[PDB]
Structure formats: C-alpha cells, structure tokens
Amino acid sequence: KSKAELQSEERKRIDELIESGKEEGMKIDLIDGKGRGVIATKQFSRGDFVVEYHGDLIEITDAKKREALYAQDPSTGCYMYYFQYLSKTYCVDATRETNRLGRLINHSKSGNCQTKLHDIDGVPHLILIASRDIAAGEELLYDYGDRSKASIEAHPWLKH
Amino acid sequence: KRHRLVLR
Ligand SMILES: C[S@@+](CC[C@H](N)C(=O)[O-])C[C@H]1O[C@@H](n2cnc3c(N)ncnc32)[C@H](O)[C@@H]1O
Numbered sequence: 001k002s003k004a005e006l007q008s009e010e011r012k013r014i015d016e017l018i019e020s021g022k023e024e025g026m027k028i029d030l031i032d033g034k035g036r037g038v039i040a041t042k043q044f045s046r047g048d049f050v051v052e053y054h055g056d057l058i059e060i061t062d063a064k065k066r067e068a069l070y071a072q073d074p075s076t077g078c079y080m081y082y083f084q085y086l087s088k089t090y091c092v093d094a095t096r097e098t099n100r101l102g103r104l105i106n107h108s109k110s111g112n113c114q115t116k117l118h119d120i121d122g123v124p125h126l127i128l129i130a131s132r133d134i135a136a137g138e139e140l141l142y143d144y145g146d147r148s149k150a151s152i153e154a155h156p157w158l159k160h
Numbered sequence: 161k162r163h164r165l166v167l168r
Pocket residue numbers: 033034035036037077078079103104105106107108157
C-alpha cells in the first residue's frame with residue numbers, strides 16, 4: 001500500500017476508537033498513594049491507542065472561570081488539561097465524575113503513555129498513545145507537564 | 161492550591 005493509503009486507514013481506525021468510546025484493555029484500581037488509577041489488563045505495543053482524555057472541551061477564558069469556581073471547594077480535584085490547537089488555547093475539563101477512564105490516569109515523568117492531539121473534522125481530541133510496550137498489570141501513567149513552583153510545592157509527586 | 165495538566 002502507498003504511505004497515504006496506510007495513513008488514511010490508520011486515521012479512520014483512530015477516529016472510530018474515539019467515536020465509539022471503546023475503552024478496552026484497562027481497569028480501575030486503587031494505586032498506593034495515588035487514589036484511583038488505571039491498570040492495563042492486556043498487553044499494549046508501542047504506538048497503540050490507549051484511551052481519550054475525555055471531558056468537556058472549552059476555551060481558555062471559560063476554563064479560567066471554572067478554575068475560580070473549583071477553587072472555592074478544596075475537596076474538588078484537578079482534571080483540567082490545557083493545550084493549543086491552531087492559534088487558540090483550549091482545555092479538556094474532566095472534573096465531572098463520569099465512567100470515562102482517561103481522567104483517572106496518574107502522573108509520572110517516566111511513564112508509559114504520551115498525549116497527542118488528534119483532530120476530527122476540525123474538532124481537537126486529546127488521546128493517550130502507548131510510548132513503549134506495556135505489560136498487563138502495569139499502571140498507566142503520563143507526564144502531566146505542570147512545572148510550576150507553586151504546583152510542585154502543593155503536589156510534591158509532580159517532581160517525579 | 162490546584163495544579164494543571166498541560167500538553168507541551
Ligand atoms: C487526573 S486525577 C487522576 C485520578 C485520581 N488519582 C483520582 O483518584 O481521581 C489527578 C490527581 O491524581 C492524583 N495523582 C496523580 N498522579 C499522582 C502521583 N504520581 N502521586 C500521587 N498522586 C497522584 C493527585 O491527587 C492528582 O491531583
């Protein structure tokens with residue numbers, strides 16, 4: 001097949017995984033010191049689609065308004081994932097408790113998933129791809145990417 | 161104090 005045929009077929013497979021919301025090969029588990037996390041129940045290969053980071057897609061101005069509201073309740077956690085798409089900044093706000101698993105994945109600077117932007121007809125989606133082979137039973141982890149001194153002081157696990 | 165997640 002031509003490189004272009006391979007790319008089109010591959011894109012269609014990812015679009016179908018995003019559209020269907022199929023979240024196979026994973027389960028919630030309690031992780032020591034981290035609250036809930038997600039563990040692989042099957043073997044993943046490097047480059048395999050893992051899961052969407054799914055929540056409410058909003059623009060940066062609306063995200064800042066929601067941060068002010070969430071800050072009124074210290075019992076509410078941190079699920080806002082900021083990113084650039086073309087010339088604007090957006091946020092996937094996954095604060096609301098749903099059945100989706102991407103929002104339950106914990107942080108590591110030396111994890112096994114990499115976040116990628118995948119657009120479908122001009123709508124951005126944040127997806128997690130395996131950055132290496134993942135053994136069944138491993139906790140899924142990615143780098144949250146927050147290097148702020150204030151964040152690290154309040155959440156020391158961001159250092160590793 | 162809240163942290164964020166950022167796609168760098
Ligand atoms: C997006 S949520 C991930 C799911 C979360 N553990 C839960 O039970 O809802 C982010 C929160 O998970 C916890 N967390 C993530 N990675 C961690 C880590 N490496 N060590 C400790 N806590 C972590 C912190 O409470 C963080 O604010």
